[PDB]
Design a protein around this ligand. Sequence first.
Ligand SMILES: [Zn+2]
Length: 257
Amino acid sequence: HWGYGKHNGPEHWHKDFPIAKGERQSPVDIDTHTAKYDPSLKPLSVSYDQATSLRILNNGHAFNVEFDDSQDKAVLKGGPLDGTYRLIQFHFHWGSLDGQGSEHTVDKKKYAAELHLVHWNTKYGDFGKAVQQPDGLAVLGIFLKVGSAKPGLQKVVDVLDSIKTKGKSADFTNFDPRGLLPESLDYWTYPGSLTTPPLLECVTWIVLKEPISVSSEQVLKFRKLNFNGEGEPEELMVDNWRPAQPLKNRQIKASFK
Ligand SMILES: [Zn+2]
């Protein structure tokens, strides 16, 4: 099925998922000199104190840290959003080398990786019905650069040895996603899509301007994961990023002057 190799990578995905060539695909390049400050934006509220992580899963494309979304426990509100969006999972995209790995770019700059915290609009009752809606989802996107270690990431790095291959999962309780956030919540926002199949056009993207720094050793451990299942030839899980897609008839708005 789909992946990130020569034969099944992002340029192929449109054959099984025609929305790949849609009007509101993600990611995009964020041209900082075309994005405009929007005074109509309310302050962004990241309310993660009651977050309940459950498990971490290698799905043969990335790894997901999954949360209990059965109540309003870890929510995103404010900014461009109308109402309350509940955190369901996060995951990353990364490169084989530090010069690439992000999906959004900033003035064509690629970061070493990118974190996506996925949330769904509680007015639609659950995630499945949220992805039938143009405002069903909000993804908080955070760039990673290589520099100092991120201590709030090390519990993730240390569990990766136990979910090396596709279909492996591990308990992952009591993980605090606050430890993944940069100091500033300045952001760009635009209407887009999920960046993996099914590529659904439901997402209000909120992409933080300030990257987090992780260490070379941390990112190196991401690169030891496998796309393949146990007992299959090793294909290292690297370069699991979709490139920038056409902006089409969209505007990117900045939360800051
Ligand atoms: Zn993603």
